[PDB]
Design a protein around this ligand. Structure first.
Ligand code: NAG
Ligand code: NAG
Ligand code: NAG
Ligand code: NAG
Ligand code: NAG
Lengths: 50, 99, 99, 79, 100
């Protein structure tokens, strides 16, 4: 479960620090949203298995 | 089949190969007359893979494989040499004398 | 794909053959150490049936056993419940794989 | 959980009877044991240990009839 | 009289294994490159299916252990000769057993 914080899920980077220090606020939203979707999907699958 | 494997899939060198009920086995010796009551590599449908280390005393000059394809048989019945019919009206049975 | 089980079906058939034959023959492991028909007599006697009627009608008890086994065997024809329960497993697996 | 069990170590081969037919055409059956023959005298033994003991009303269950393959023993009118 | 009736109990199911990469991205290298950044979804699917199949194997061994616990047979037993005791016929229930 901790390994899912290092996948990119289609973004340019897995780190939010490296996204927010490189892009405009209108263009960081498209990159942050993919990480949000991937991490919520990983949490959903974990909760189902428990 | 092992013909399909050694013709249409691989072309690399493999000395040990044989066909089996599960499919084509490479790098293992056919030893299904031998039986094993506890296996770590269970292949399905009653077979298993055993690992035999060749030690210093049995120096394999001619090569073999350390992998053997054997039979998995985890449970047995105890047997007695007694009879199954009546020996003159009575039955022949085994009763403990110490515990 | 569907993998084979780790024990074959002839193996499990041998296990149930051993469990059936352990009730009939003179160790009598799965029949409480007594013969089969004596076990049937004591089990009916534990319901409130006297020993005289069971000592008289032993042939009729054996005939009713044979008749019940024959009626079990001739009855797997398209309206059984056990056959429907067996075929529901296979139908469900095939539907899940096709979907 | 620690389970303790009774384990037999030594065995013996005995010829046994599952019931006896007495005078008056009565029957007895052994109560968790077998009927054995010692010195041409019928006797009782348990099923999990070999120890002959006299036939009494603690070892048997009486029957007003007798089964068709019980062993005929007219000598017994014992305890 | 004596009545008889039968009952089926299910103790297993088919053991399905899935190659995640061949299912998602069939034969195409660009699809495999795009799938490589999803990381550990395919490995998670394979690990859960291996857990299910291990549970199936454990229950099969428990059934087989329950059937065979504590049964002692005669070595002189032969289901060709011995298929009947006390006018009750058991030939339809016995398979093959014996040293021949
Ligand atoms: C493997 O060995 C068994 C007996 O050891 C034999 O019956 C079987 O035919 C062998 N398989 C092949 C492919 O030779
Ligand atoms: C029967 O199976 C048991 C399982 O542990 C094994 O120890 C034993 O050696 C086997 N006996 C024979 C005769 O195969
Ligand atoms: C054991 O069985 C063999 C045949 O399987 C028989 O020849 C032998 O006499 C038996 N031994 C005893 C002590 O009963
Ligand atoms: C039972 O076994 C123990 C140890 O194995 C031995 O000391 C004892 O004498 C035995 N008793 C009989 C009756 O064989
Ligand atoms: C009694 O013993 C004879 C002797 O073989 C046998 O044929 C018959 O089936 C037995 N009957 C019963 C009820 O045990």
């Amino acid at each position: 479960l901790l390994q899912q914080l290092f996948n990119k899920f289609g973004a340019i980077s897995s780190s939010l620090q490296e996204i927010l220090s490189r892009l405009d606020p209108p263009e960081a939203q498209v990159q942050i949203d993919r990480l949000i979707n991937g991490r919520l999907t990983a949490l959903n699958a974990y909760v189902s298995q428990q | 089949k092992c013909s399909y494997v050694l013709n249409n899939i691989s072309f690399i060198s493999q000395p040990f190969y044989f066909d089996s009920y599960l499919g084509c086995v490479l790098n293992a010796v056919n030893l299904t007359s031998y039986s094993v009551s506890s296996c770590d590599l269970r292949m399905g449908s009653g077979f298993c893979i055993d690992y035999a280390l060749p030690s210093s005393g049995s120096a394999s000059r001619g090569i073999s494989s350390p992998y053997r394809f054997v039979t998995f048989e985890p449970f047995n019945v105890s047997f007695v040499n007694d009879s199954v019919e009546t020996v003159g009206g009575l039955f022949e049975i085994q009763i403990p004398t110490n515990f | 794909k569907v993998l084979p089980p780790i024990l074959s079906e002839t193996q499990i058939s041998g296990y149930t053959t051993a469990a059936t034959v352990a009730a009939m023959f003179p160790p009598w492991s799965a029949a409480a150490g007594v013969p089969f028909s004596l076990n049937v007599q004591y089990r009916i006697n534990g319901l409130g049936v006297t020993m005289d009627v069971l000592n008289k009608n032993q042939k009729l008890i054996a005939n009713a056993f044979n008749k019940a086994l024959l009626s079990i065997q001739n009855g797997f024809t398209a309206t059984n419940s056990a056959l429907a329960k067996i075929q529901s497993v296979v139908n469900a697996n095939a539907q899940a794989l096709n979907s | 959980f620690i389970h303790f069990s009774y384990k037999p170590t030594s065995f013996k081969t005995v010829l046994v009877s599952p019931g006896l037919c007495l005078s008056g055409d009565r029957g007895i059956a052994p109560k968790q044991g077998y009927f054995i023959k010692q010195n041409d005298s019928w006797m009782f033994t348990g099923s999990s240990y070999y120890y002959p003991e006299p036939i009494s009303d603690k070892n048997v269950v009486f029957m007003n009839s007798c089964s068709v393959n019980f062993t005929k023993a007219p000598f017994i009118y014992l305890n | 009289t004596i009545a008889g009736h039968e009952e089926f109990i299910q103790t297993s199911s088919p053991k399905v294994t899935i190659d995640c990469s061949a299912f998602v991205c069939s034969n195409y290298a660009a699809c495999h490159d795009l799938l490589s950044e999803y990381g550990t979804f395919c490995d998670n699917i394979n690990s859960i299916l291996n857990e299910v199949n291990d549970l199936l194997d454990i229950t099969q061994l428990q059934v087989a252990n329950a059937l065979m616990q504590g049964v002692t047979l005669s070595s002189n037993l032969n289901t060709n000769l011995h298929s009947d005791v006390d006018n009750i016929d058991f030939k339809s229930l016995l398979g093959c057993l014996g040293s021949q």
